[PDB]
Design brief:
Two copies of one chain form a homodimer. Helix content of chain A is 9%, strand content 41%. Chain A is mostly beta strands. The first copy, chain A, has three domains: 109 residues, Nuclear Transport Factor 2, Chain: A (Roll); 132 residues, Nuclear Transport Factor 2, Chain: A (Roll), CATH 3.10.450; 420 residues, Copper amine oxidase, catalytic domain (Beta-galactosidase, Chain A, domain 5, Distorted Sandwich), CATH 2.70.98.20. Chain A has a 28-stranded mixed sheet that branches. Bound molecules: a molecule of 3 linked components (NAG-NAG-MAN) (2 copies), a molecule of 2 linked components (NAG-NAG) (2 copies), 2-acetamido-2-deoxy-beta-D-glucopyranose (NAG) (4 copies), calcium ion (4 copies) and copper (II) ion (2 copies). Chain B: This is Amine oxidase [copper-containing] 3.
Chain lengths: 701, 705
């Protein structure tokens, strides 16, 4: 690995040592920080400048300094802010730059900071010790309440309030189900907690919700109940089935099919670079933005500088305040931070290579997520190509598709997002995103038809949309790229020969798109059938070397623009956009957007601003998603079938012929040959497997 | 009810029907393999599918099974008024009756020019071409393309310009050796009029050489001699893989191999497949291609039938062949052109392979060896999983393993790959890939509007691909309705803070009541959730549903103003839902191809102001894309990104995800040893899977002459 490798535990420790020195002892461990402390919230790789980086990979120039970016919580002060500090060079840091205002134009308001885990503990303490017992009347008759046992548990929602500067979060209450998902057991109560004060003692409950009704306080509710004005119904807290359990009641049977490598792995993983005979690339995770791939070279030629997840978004509907106002912008929690171990043989093939990831977040020392990535070759059991000739000449030639895959999974509370990077031997790249895990349920009460389906006894599966944003820094045969839109048209013409007759003449249409706005495509509008970035260079046949972007999405209608918060994820409105790549436009979102979408720290629509994309270094931005109306078959989990979205990058006249023609694994034989002869056909030479003992990456405390 | 009602005819059965017919068709019946236009012959013999009512009575209520019958297509050329007739023969295995159903189905006789072109006809055409026509230009040909054969002809789309025409444009190509002639068009195209019942009356209506039209082959020779023709010299031979299919690179370490550590987990018996979740029957129609029948998930039928109906390629170009090609492939026949699966390339090595039998343009059954494969595939992707670090520590998940049936139709150049994929969640996935060689034209003139140059002298002509599929869902029984659900945002005041506004996300539910309400043109928008449902409810009160999720990137359909568009009306619909009807068994016909202007079936007729509330409904799905060929399509189109089709996904059909009860799921709490066999079957894998089976020896199903 090297240039793009996430920071090592060693490097992380070094950056933290350096930070503990240059900041005013009285710096607290973020894992215990109160709002008014100072705090290292995160430390992670700071990605090199593109120009320096290429200089080093393509033209011998030495590597750009290796730096970290640290996000610090400055609450021990008259005007608290959040600061972004670059720290470097590594491995032995000597400087520390504050880029906060360079990037943002001013300080970062302190309410934009992510809720810390200690902040959650404190909210819980407030709820469970000071607020809930005031309703131990009601809660005994609906939800088996006790002392503080407790049987209940809370889950956060979306943005936290109704306008910039708010930090008030709606929480639902849930049975603390054991060994299975609590998410399906909303007990009916929702609390609007205002935790904006830096003194958690000034924290208040602004609103309460129970069975379709609102109250200004729990005591108010508890009173309405003692007055016999609130019909209570005792919600069971145990059960059987998928609703209550994830473990299967059926004895295991004969094993599922297993793939192995007869003559060993055909790719290697060194640090965080992957090389096969066809592909080399580096991979990693942003703490906040998650999966990323750099420096992808097919057969030594670079196709893409960067492909990375930008953001993941979930917009809910509901019967209830928590659900009806939820809009998660998941980078506010962090796709890398919340990445989880892969279970060997379930999350990936048993014989995949599994790699660890290290991080420093909300603590003062490095921690490791074991088995966070997997890399493997997968025989797709589908041919890449084949032709069987019975006509004029008797031959067969084809090649079975084997694919190279990098994967990790982020578990954002209930959801488990699966991120796939798939390298094809045709020179196509496939980026996929699947959502499994648990749905968010609401408590089923009142008229629920317009907001979801009943999916269990007391469980409303609430309607929502999922979407995700991808950065695609194609460098098609260099940096200077154009974008083409090709498509088709019928044109009625007379038949040349028989001009009395007509015919619909099918024609290709091509259009160069020269301005950003011309290549920004809104969800809901139609897009050209062929859409690619090209070089001015041509292939042997004189067509522009191109890579075409083909989208797999079933986009739901994006949050309408009139929303005060919509600019916190404006990329949701576009399917495809292509901009000039700028060093000051590294992401389309930010960890800070989540807690203030009303005053977005980054607003994607800014990137589309009347510049030229004709012969420039272009980056393309892809949105993919779908509507989800949960249904009974989402219990216990939603399945991955049919729910993969993303895109293909496919060569389009980039090469002079299909590269797989030169494949070591292709098969060919003529009728006149002995197809069963080892020399004619390597399929005829075929041919303990050796399984590593099973280990699991464990859990986090 | 235990009988294979949906099995394709066996050789014995085919032979049997052929014998019966031989007797009863009478004098001067000819083997169609050598038949002339004016002969009488049997073109095909295949299974007549039972009528549903009787079939279900047998399968569900245990009634006696309907008679097993065949349908034979007979070309009656030896008479005053030639006709093609459709005859039913049964009951198998010892047939005793035959009935002509032609008029019942089509309202009149089948005009003779609709018949597919016989292989003998192709052969005769070639004789007129190479023995009486091309020689008139031996001069040009000697100059331009190494004449003295060395050329092969290849047919095209509809044959003419009005109903009744049988004029085919034939392109000429270097007979290339051991690789595709398709890329080596030498620039000459002949418009052969082979309508005449006497092949000696067949003429050449027109000529086309490298950009120029000529009235005859003689006139072309004339001008070439008069020094009046600028001849482009196209090479005979080359090396590049627009010339070879054979990789010039030595075999490396072996690609991954899949195997079943503890024996297989499904079984194939005849045309029935069964595993612990699924049972269904499969086969090929000689013309319509792949079909699966009677699909049961854990004992419950979901679909009576899913079957390919038609496949369609619409070309553009500036040469007259490609400019006017609209292939309606059922006219060649997707079953008929099915090819053996190469073990290890077309399906996994350890798939189970299955032969297919047919009697087509012959008088004796033949067998395509290994026409089908069936296998479990480990997807390398979990079906579901959740890792909890929060409050309670556990992991629960299931690797997806899927059950596949595949066959491949090689129509000329194209290799179509058809997948039926059975998911453990209750979902069915239907896929269609095109691979093989593109069709090409001699590269000449103003090609940018018609494709990309793709090789020396080789223009990859632009075209669309479409396939139509029949999906006879019987959701919890025959009586089904269709629902369209979707979303909307309704702007309103935040209930607890009226100062503010929120965009309230809601679900939208519309019952679609008439066939037209459920027909959806290409390029119009479609309900994000479209499903067929019972009025029966699942445990939670929602109608039991199967939803149809389409994966298509459709091209613009051929414009309706085209006199021939009625021959593939289905192309203009993405999705339509219709009342199932015994008289509407297919959306296309083997006969639409050679007269699309007078279609034998017009799919649009099925859509005609009838209720679809509470009836036996059948859905029809169209899937396809635009293809602008390009360098990477040489030697072949690759299958990546080319998959097109649809899923049938359960939607409140069950009470909960059936996969919760899977025998293969994995679960363990934080407080257990995930490394212990008693907690986790995966732990056992090493020690009881250091046992890979001996592979069977490689064999190939052969080629055919
Ligand atoms: C956000 O908070 C930061 C600290 O709370 C702040 O950076 C700090 O800025 C102060 C002065 O603005 C610097 O303190 C320095 O003050 C004396 C002058 O008497 C200087 O000579 C010394 O350099 C001394 O340390 C801090 O160095 C600095 N802390 C760090 C880590 O940079 C930011 O200015 C605040 N951000 C904005 C935009 O307001
Ligand atoms: C389409 O083509 C068929 C011609 O081969 C034709 O079927 C044949 O029709 C005749 C009468 O319709 C039948 O032959 C009959 O000849 C004597 C006359 O002395 C009759 O009295 C007898 O009934 C005798 O059978 C043929 O048997 C019959 N062949 C079969 C297999 O059906 C069709 O009628 C033509 N139909 C169309 C729609 O025009
Ligand atoms: C076209 O070229 C092919 C060359 O592959 C010819 O195929 C061979 O034909 C000979 C007889 O002349 C046979 O004995 C061989 O078995 C054939 N070889 C293969 C691999 O099929 C073919 O004759 C030529 N056909 C035409 C119409 O030109
Ligand atoms: C919620 O319930 C869970 C029970 O599953 C509790 O988690 C356990 O905590 C006990 C001690 O209190 C441990 O000894 C167990 O090993 C834990 N279980 C595992 C497998 O994670 C927990 O007390 C409750 N937490 C909350 C917030 O109420
Ligand atoms: C493409 O553009 C750059 C100049 O801006 C040039 O260096 C390169 O060689 C060009 N190639 C062409 C037009 O063939
Ligand atoms: C877009 O760009 C051109 C400058 O090249 C500028 O003159 C034009 O006014 C711009 N349009 C807008 C709306 O800013
Ligand atoms: C389904 O609807 C038909 C109404 O035409 C009715 O006869 C049948 O009883 C209904 N069943 C249910 C369960 O609603
Ligand atoms: C379509 O359906 C209804 C009958 O239920 C009728 O009123 C309407 O006029 C019909 N139109 C037709 C068949 O032309
Ligand atoms: Ca770029
Ligand atoms: Ca810009
Ligand atoms: Ca039906
Ligand atoms: Ca109808
Ligand atoms: Cu969802
Ligand atoms: Cu194509």
């Amino acid at each position: 690995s090297q240039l793009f490798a996430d920071l090592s535990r060693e490097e992380l420790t070094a950056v933290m040592r350096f930070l503990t020195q240059r900041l005013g002892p009285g710096l607290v461990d973020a894992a215990q920080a109160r709002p008014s402390d100072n705090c290292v919230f995160s430390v992670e790789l700071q990605l090199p400048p593109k120009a320096a980086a290429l200089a080093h990979l393509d033209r011998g120039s030495p590597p750009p300094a290796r730096e970290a970016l640290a996000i610090v919580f400055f609450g021990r002060q008259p005007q608290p802010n959040v600061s972004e500090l670059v720290v470097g060079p590594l491995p032995h840091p000597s400087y520390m730059r504050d880029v906060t205002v360079e990037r943002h134009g001013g300080p970062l308001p302190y309410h934009r900071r992510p809720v810390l885990f200690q902040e959650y503990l404190d909210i819980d303490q407030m709820i469970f010790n000071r607020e809930l017992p005031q309703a131990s009347g009601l809660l005994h008759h609906c939800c088996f309440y006790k002392h503080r046992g407790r049987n209940l548990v809370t889950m956060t929602t979306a943005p936290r309030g109704l306008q910039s500067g708010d930090r008030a979060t709606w929480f639902g209450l849930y049975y603390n189900i054991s060994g299975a998902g609590f998410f399906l057991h909303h007990v009916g109560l929702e609390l609007l907690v205002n935790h904006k004060a830096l003194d958690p003692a000034r924290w208040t409950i602004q609103k309460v919700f129970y069975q379709g009704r609102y109250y200004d306080s729990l005591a108010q509710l508890e009173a309405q109940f003692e007055a016999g004005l609130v019909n209570v119904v005792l919600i069971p807290d145990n059960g059987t089935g998928g609703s209550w359990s994830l473990k299967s009641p059926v004895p295991p049977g004969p094993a599922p099919p297993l793939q192995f490598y007869p003559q060993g792995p055909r790719f290697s993983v060194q640090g965080s670079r992957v090389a096969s005979s066809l592909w080399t690339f580096s991979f990693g995770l942003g703490a906040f933005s998650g999966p990323r791939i750099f420096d992808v070279r097919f057969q030594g030629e670079r196709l893409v500088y960067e492909i990375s997840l930008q953001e993941a978004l979930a917009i809910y509907g509901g019967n209830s305040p928590a659900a009806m106002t939820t809009r998660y912008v998941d980078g506010g929690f962090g796709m890398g931070k919340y990445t989880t171990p892969l279970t060997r043989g379930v999350d990936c093939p048993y014989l995949a290579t599994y790699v660890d990831w290290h991080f420093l977040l909300e603590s003062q020392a490095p921690k490791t997520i074991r088995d966070a990535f997997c890399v493997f070759e997968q025989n797709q059991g589908l041919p890449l190509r084949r032709h069987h000739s019975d006509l004029y000449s008797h031959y067969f030639g084809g090649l079975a598709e084997t694919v190279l895959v990098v994967r990790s999974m982020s578990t954002l509370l209930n959801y488990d997002y699966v991120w796939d990077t798939v390298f094809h031997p045709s020179g196509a790249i496939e980026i996929r995103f699947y959502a499994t895990g648990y749905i968010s349920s609401a408590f089923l009460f009142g008229a629920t038809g317009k907001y979801g389906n009943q999916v269990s006894e007391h469980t409303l599966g609430t309607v929502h949309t999922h979407s995700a944003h991808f950065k695609v820094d194609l460098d098609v045969a260099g940096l200077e790229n154009w974008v083409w839109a090709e498509d088709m048209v019928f044109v009625p013409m007379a038949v040349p020969w028989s001009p009395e007759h007509q015919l619909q003449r099918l024609q290709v249409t091509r259009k160069l798109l020269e301005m950003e706005e011309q290549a920004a495509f809104l969800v809901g509008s139609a897009t050209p059938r062929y859409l690619y970035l090209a070089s001015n260079h041509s292939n042997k046949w004189g067509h522009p070397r191109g890579y075409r972007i083909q989208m797999l999405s079933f986009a739901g209608e994006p949050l309408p623009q009139n929303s005060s918060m919509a600019r916190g994820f404006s990329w949701e409105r576009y399917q495809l956009a292509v901009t000039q790549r700028k060093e000051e436009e590294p992401s389309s979102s930010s960890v800070f957007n989540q807690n203030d979408p009303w005053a977005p720290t980054v607003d994607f629509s800014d990137f589309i601003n009347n510049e030229t994309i004709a012969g420039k270094d272009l980056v393309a931005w892809v949105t993919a998603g779908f509507l989800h109306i949960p249904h009974a078959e989402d219990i216990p989990n939603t399945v991955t079938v049919g729910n993969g979205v993303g895109f293909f990058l496919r060569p389009y006249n980039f090469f002079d012929e299909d590269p797989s023609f030169y494949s070591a694994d292709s098969i060919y034989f003529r009728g006149d040959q002995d197809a069963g002869a080892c020399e004619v056909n390597p399929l005829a030479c075929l041919p303990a497997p050796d399984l590593p003992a099973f280990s699991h990456g464990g859990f986090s405390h």
